[PDB]
Amino acid sequence: GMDTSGKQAEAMALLAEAERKVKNSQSFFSGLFGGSSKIEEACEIYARAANMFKMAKNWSAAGNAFCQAAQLHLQLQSKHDAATCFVDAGNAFKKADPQEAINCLMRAIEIYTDMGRFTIAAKHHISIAEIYETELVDVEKAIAHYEQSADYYKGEESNSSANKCLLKVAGYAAQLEQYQKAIDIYEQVGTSAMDSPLLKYSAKDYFFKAALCHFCIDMLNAKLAVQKYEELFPAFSDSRECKLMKKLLEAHEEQNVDSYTESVKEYDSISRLDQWLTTMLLRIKKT
């Protein structure tokens, strides 16, 4: 419609006017020492142009304008506004081209952590990890970012949020065929959540995962593991997971693949299985 062409033309004209203003700013400063009024006004034009490009659905132009404004205002010794503009540019980049958003968010994180504002740095690290996860399958960088964010959250004494980051880290680590970290994280989270009033009802679930992640190593250490949990949390015996584990162990003890498969089918029929659980059960079945 008219919006595309009209917004593009008006934004281009305004940006060209801003370019002329910044070009004349040096001459003005040299001839009269006007100060920073010209530079601040040019930054205002750049911000307005970036916003207009954002409304015009042209993400790249908005990101470029945000970067220009951020750089100019950082030259003015204002690190806070520079970080804000860089965050906007990174979002536009994550909304236009993500690779640039990675470095923009890294710079914003550095600026913020320079002052000791750890919560914002942790949130930005989580955002970067999410960016890595969505497009690429480079799990290692996501694990590093999640570990950094969880460490920051733990250092801020903000519990119930680092737990989720550690759960994500353990779940992704269990995918790479490295089970020790997953077992440790799962057991720690389960024992921590056992005592909470609200979280108590979920605790059981965590244990089950560990048991599955404990079954690949060797069957002997899985059986015993179950015992260690049941004595500590007797109510675990009530959940369906214990019965399923016992039936699977009995089926496997005699190479009875068919009984194991039938029990898995029945449990899936009652409640649909997750891709993670499906993959892990398939891996266990290979033996």
Partner: protein, 104 residues
């Protein structure tokens, strides 16, 4: 003689599993010796040593029946001490065993 720490392991072969002898390395003990294994302050079991070149030093290898009876895990540390039977009170003359097929 006071006992030494050692790591549990799996039997390198199948034939050795059929003799009820703790499969060990030649660099630690010698075949024919008997040892007492300790895991808890109230569990004291006994095994027959049998050296084999394929056993890594610092570990004993146990068969599936042996591990099941002893409730041992592959990796846990144990305290093994030499045990020399005195041929004056434990020389078997008449013994009885309950025998049943292993595999179902």
């Amino acid at each position: 003689m006071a006992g030494r720490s050692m790591q549990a392991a799996r039997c390198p072969t199948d034939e050795l599993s059929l003799s009820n002898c703790a499969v060990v390395s030649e660099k630690d003990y010698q075949s024919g010796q008997h040892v007492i294994v300790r895991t808890s302050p109230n569990h004291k079991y006994i095994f027959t040593l049998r050296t084999h070149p394929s056993v890594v030093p610092g570990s004993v290898a146990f068969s599936l029946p042996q591990r099941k009876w002893a409730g041992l895990s592959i990796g846990q540390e144990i305290e093994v001490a030499l045990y020399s039977f005195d041929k004056a009170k434990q020389c078997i003359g008449t013994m009885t065993i309950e025998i049943d097929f292993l595999q179902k």
